Amino acid sequence: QVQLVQSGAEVKKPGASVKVSCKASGYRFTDHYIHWVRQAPGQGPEWMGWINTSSGRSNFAQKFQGRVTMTRDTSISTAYMELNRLKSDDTAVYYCTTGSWISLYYDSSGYPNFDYWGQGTLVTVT
Amino acid sequence: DIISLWDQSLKPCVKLTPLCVTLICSDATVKTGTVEEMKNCSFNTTTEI
Amino acid sequence: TQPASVSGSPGQPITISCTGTSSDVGNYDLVSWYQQHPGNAPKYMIYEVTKRPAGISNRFSGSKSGNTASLTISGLQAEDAADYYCCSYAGSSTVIFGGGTKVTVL
Amino acid sequence: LNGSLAEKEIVIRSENLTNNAKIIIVHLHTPVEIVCTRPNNNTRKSVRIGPGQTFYATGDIIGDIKQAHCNISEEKWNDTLQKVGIELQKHFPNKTI
Ligand SMILES: *[C@@H]1O[C@H](CO)[C@@H](O[C@@H]2O[C@H](CO)[C@@H](O[C@@H]3O[C@H](CO[C@H]4O[C@H](CO)[C@@H](O)[C@H](O)[C@@H]4O)[C@@H](O)[C@H](O[C@H]4O[C@H](CO)[C@@H](O)[C@H](O)[C@@H]4O[C@H]4O[C@H](CO)[C@@H](O)[C@H](O)[C@@H]4O[C@H]4O[C@H](CO)[C@@H](O)[C@H](O)[C@@H]4O)[C@@H]3O)[C@H](O)[C@H]2NC(C)=O)[C@H](O)[C@H]1NC(C)=O
Ligand SMILES: *[C@@H]1O[C@H](CO)[C@@H](O[C@@H]2O[C@H](CO)[C@@H](O[C@@H]3O[C@H](CO[C@H]4O[C@H](CO)[C@@H](O)[C@H](O)[C@@H]4O)[C@@H](O)[C@H](O[C@H]4O[C@H](CO)[C@@H](O)[C@H](O)[C@@H]4O)[C@@H]3O)[C@H](O)[C@H]2NC(C)=O)[C@H](O)[C@H]1NC(C)=O
Ligand SMILES: *[C@@H]1O[C@H](CO)[C@@H](O[C@@H]2O[C@H](CO)[C@@H](O[C@@H]3O[C@H](CO)[C@@H](O)[C@H](O)[C@@H]3O)[C@H](O)[C@H]2NC(C)=O)[C@H](O)[C@H]1NC(C)=O
Ligand SMILES: *[C@@H]1O[C@H](CO)[C@@H](O[C@@H]2O[C@H](CO)[C@@H](O[C@@H]3O[C@H](CO)[C@@H](O)[C@H](O)[C@@H]3O)[C@H](O)[C@H]2NC(C)=O)[C@H](O)[C@H]1NC(C)=O
Ligand SMILES: *[C@@H]1O[C@H](CO)[C@@H](O[C@@H]2O[C@H](CO)[C@@H](O[C@@H]3O[C@H](CO)[C@@H](O)[C@H](O)[C@@H]3O)[C@H](O)[C@H]2NC(C)=O)[C@H](O)[C@H]1NC(C)=O
Ligand SMILES: *[C@@H]1O[C@H](CO)[C@@H](O)[C@H](O)[C@H]1NC(C)=O
Ligand SMILES: *[C@@H]1O[C@H](CO)[C@@H](O)[C@H](O)[C@H]1NC(C)=O
């Protein structure tokens, strides 16, 4: 069984930055895409971005540009979500999900095959 | 016939003489990827004026 | 687009719809469904337009007509009262969601 | 590619078959299908150069970056090379190609 471990709670004032870690176990980190899902409380989930874990190429949503960076390290098999200039509406649950199969010949990045979901983290902005 | 057809089709189109300038090319692809054959080249083009 | 909630007695099928544009569902058959119990991570039992992963029975069935996609739940049980979200590929390698449907099993 | 096929047998044509600097045209009887693709979603932008002339170039690549390639069936290509070897060993007898 594979499993994704996510960080703890992040409580801070607006205007700062939050790093959320996602550590994979049970399978190869290089083989699969990593997607990010943000869910506000009392509100349905929302896709926020994907990263190619083989080459570090990442893309975000149409309105997260300029605020979101995504990195990863294949040696310890983890991914980092950096969000800058948070606001009071950023209090939400963050989920690291495992996407499709990374292939060298066709673009399967946008496939919404979110197989395994992490335990998530809660980010509260006060 | 193939040579002359190619030339007479290619005759009235745009000529890329003002584009042969000094190009500053840093990088386009994020990492090596599959093949990093893209290259982000910038230059000083000439406007209508 | 998604209906806010649906209700149904146990032992009968129900349907949850998601009507998208031509670019969202009409162009690409990439649609998926995820249920979520409150205070828990969302589940995963539909990935393609009709397929199901291992460990999921024939309770749920996906279908697509034109610009909408419908999930049919053949029978209702007490654990089937989770919040259901549809999800799809949309345009320039981006992914959109539905918003939420709450199932009320009587 | 996309040529006319031979009628019943693979036809091997050359000027001499003993001069090594002569191109051998091998003419197959059964076509072999090739599928070629460039999968990365590419864009186009127009750069104005001079009065009334534009220049179209690659503006951005949208999505992930994958590899342009071509696909042939391995079994059919092996069978085609084997049949070409059958037809070619009778012009170079008692030899392995
Ligand atoms: C030119 O030629 C090249 C080379 O031939 C072509 O490149 C190939 O193209 C293939 C196109 O399909 C592509 O195939 C994919 O392979 C994936 C890798 O898996 C295979 O390899 C591993 C290697 O170890 C094996 O272990 C494994 O068993 C396989 O043999 C598959 O995973 C892909 O299938 C999945 O995606 C399709 C997409 O819709 C799904 O429909 C399908 O059902 C599969 O979905 C499963 O996996 C996804 C993501 O992993 C899950 O989200 C989903 O729920 C499914 O989950 C399975 O597993 C769970 C586990 O619990 C289970 O519950 C569930 O029931 C499912 O069983 C796909 O088949 C090749 O990789 C690719 N490359 C190579 C080198 O071959 C190229 O396309 C050609 N180009 C042209 C233009 O022709
Ligand atoms: C290949 O190489 C080319 C050029 O070498 C790159 O193109 C430039 O990329 C940069 C980075 O994205 C662009 O800069 C951004 O432009 C946005 C819109 O452009 C207008 O505004 C800027 C002023 O910011 C003007 O200079 C420009 O002429 C336009 O009028 C801005 O909204 C961005 O501003 C944001 O970021 C800056 C910090 O960078 C902050 O200070 C701002 O407050 C704001 O938050 C930013 O400036 C630039 O416009 C692009 N074009 C050119 C001609 O330089 C490609 O990105 C590069 N890569 C690829 C893949 O093509
Ligand atoms: C395209 O045109 C621009 C002008 O808009 C060119 O930029 C200019 O380039 C020169 C060098 O060719 C720069 O001069 C340099 O100044 C620094 C000090 O600032 C000095 O240390 C250097 O030795 C050199 O003299 C100049 O600053 C720069 N900018 C301007 C506004 O003139 C550009 O080179 C042209 N070509 C390309 C490929 O972009
Ligand atoms: C490959 O890249 C192209 C270039 O972006 C993608 O085309 C874009 O597709 C989206 C939706 O599929 C288009 O958005 C739509 O625009 C119309 C008109 O503005 C609007 O009414 C819709 O509501 C929607 O916003 C977008 O315009 C279009 N861009 C271009 C330049 O055509 C294409 O989808 C990409 N292919 C894949 C497989 O990802
Ligand atoms: C097609 O190929 C044949 C090959 O036999 C050409 O005929 C001539 O064949 C003689 C031998 O039968 C060649 O002589 C050889 O010369 C070398 C070097 O001088 C020597 O070491 C050998 O012992 C042998 O004597 C001769 O070179 C060859 N002529 C040419 C022009 O290659 C025939 O001409 C070719 N063309 C046609 C249209 O048939
Ligand atoms: C058949 O073709 C080969 C190669 O083109 C040639 O050397 C040979 O002389 C030809 N035979 C006849 C009878 O035309
Ligand atoms: C060349 O091969 C054929 C058939 O395999 C055979 O009959 C013939 O004897 C061989 N030539 C020599 C010189 O052995």
Side-chain angles (χ1 to χ4, degrees):
Chain A
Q1 183 66 41
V2 308
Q3 197 252 322
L4 315 181
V5 187
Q6 287 193 237
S7 304
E10 299 272 344
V11 185
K12 48 174 62 194
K13 297 307 185 182
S17 293
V18 175
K19 172 212 290 296
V20 175
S21 68
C22 165
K23 159 77 168 60
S25 67
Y27 81 119
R28 183 189 297 277
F29 186 75
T30 313
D31 268 347
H32 275 255
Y33 280 100
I34 288 300
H35 298 260
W36 288 100
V37 168
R38 185 175 80 163
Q39 171 157 47
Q43 155 67 27
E46 171 187 26
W47 176 83
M48 186 181 36
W50 63 266
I51 190 167
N52 196 344
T53 70
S54 300
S55 83
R57 169 68 172 262
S58 63
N59 200 354
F60 324 114
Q62 72 268 18
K63 64 91 175 179
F64 281 100
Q65 298 282 338
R67 309 206 317 132
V68 162
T69 52
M70 293 180 183
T71 54
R72 88 285 183 274
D73 186 74
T74 70
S75 77
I76 62 172
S77 82
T78 188
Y80 310 130
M81 171 45 158
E82 306 275 344
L83 176 55
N84 294 283
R85 310 169 277 140
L86 278 82
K87 263 78 66 179
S88 57
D89 62 358
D90 276 310
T91 294
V93 191
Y94 282 68
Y95 285 114
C96 179
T97 79
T98 302
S100 71
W101 201 72
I102 291 181
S103 176
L104 190 65
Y105 295 116
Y106 67 100
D107 187 17
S108 84
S109 57
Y111 286 180
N113 307 325
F114 303 142
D115 314 322
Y116 299 96
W117 286 59
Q119 89 259 25
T121 184
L122 73 165
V123 179
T124 55
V125 177
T126 57
Chain B
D1 290 8
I2 292 308
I3 295 283
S4 66
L5 271 183
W6 188 262
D7 294 357
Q8 74 99 33
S9 57
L10 207 47
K11 179 155 61 49
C13 292
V14 192
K15 192 170 295 193
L16 299 184
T17 51
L19 188 153
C20 179
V21 290
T22 295
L23 267 56
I24 293 301
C25 311
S26 302
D27 202 16
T29 311
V30 172
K31 190 176 180 180
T32 176
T34 62
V35 173
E36 41 181 2
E37 41 174 351
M38 281 305 158
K39 207 100 176 172
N40 195 359
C41 293
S42 49
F43 44 86
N44 282 331
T45 197
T46 313
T47 46
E48 302 94 2
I49 309 300
Chain C
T1 58
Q2 205 173 2
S5 197
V6 76
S7 73
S9 76
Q12 65 179 1
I14 49 162
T15 46
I16 299 169
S17 67
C18 276
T19 297
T21 63
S22 68
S23 56
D24 298 334
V25 193
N27 273 117
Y28 322 101
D29 64 327
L30 298 171
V31 73
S32 52
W33 293 85
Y34 311 97
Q35 83 180 358
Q36 178 186 46
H37 289 126
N40 208 17
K43 221 175 169 292
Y44 157 71
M45 71 305 297
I46 293 290
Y47 58 98
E48 277 295 325
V49 65
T50 51
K51 298 183 183 66
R52 279 185 298 271
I56 296 91
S57 170
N58 308 80
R59 172 71 65 241
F60 304 99
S61 162
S63 56
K64 181 197 147 187
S65 66
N67 283 319
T68 184
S70 60
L71 168 68
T72 299
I73 314 179
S74 313
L76 270 181
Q77 310 304 129
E79 84 281 341
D80 299 333
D83 276 288
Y84 285 74
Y85 319 101
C86 69
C87 179
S88 82
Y89 181 85
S92 302
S93 89
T94 69
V95 163
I96 62 170
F97 271 77
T101 287
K102 173 66 175 185
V103 182
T104 308
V105 183
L106 309 176
Chain D
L1 306 153
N2 278 334
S4 61
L5 300 148
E7 190 53 56
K8 61 102 176 179
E9 204 56 47
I10 290 171
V11 180
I12 292 169
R13 311 191 176 96
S14 169
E15 200 167 24
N16 212 14
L17 291 174
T18 56
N19 201 351
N20 279 264
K22 296 307 171 167
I23 311 293
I24 297 89
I25 319 288
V26 190
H27 210 263
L28 312 178
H29 164 50
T30 53
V32 176
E33 190 149 354
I34 187 168
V35 181
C36 289
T37 182
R38 176 204 72 185
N40 52 3
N41 193 0
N42 200 358
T43 53
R44 182 162 96 183
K45 63 172 275 188
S46 53
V47 176
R48 168 76 41 85
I49 296 181
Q53 310 165 333
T54 57
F55 155 73
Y56 302 95
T58 285
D60 205 353
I61 292 175
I62 288 175
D64 212 348
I65 289 188
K66 308 298 190 175
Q67 167 81 262
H69 58 271
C70 296
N71 276 351
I72 314 171
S73 284
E74 189 183 34
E75 164 207 2
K76 311 299 182 192
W77 181 252
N78 207 301
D79 201 25
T80 302
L81 274 186
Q82 195 172 9
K83 289 181 176 184
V84 165
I86 282 176
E87 204 80 16
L88 189 55
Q89 216 166 5
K90 73 165 56 60
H91 299 263
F92 286 84
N94 307 111
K95 265 212 180 74
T96 299
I97 61 166

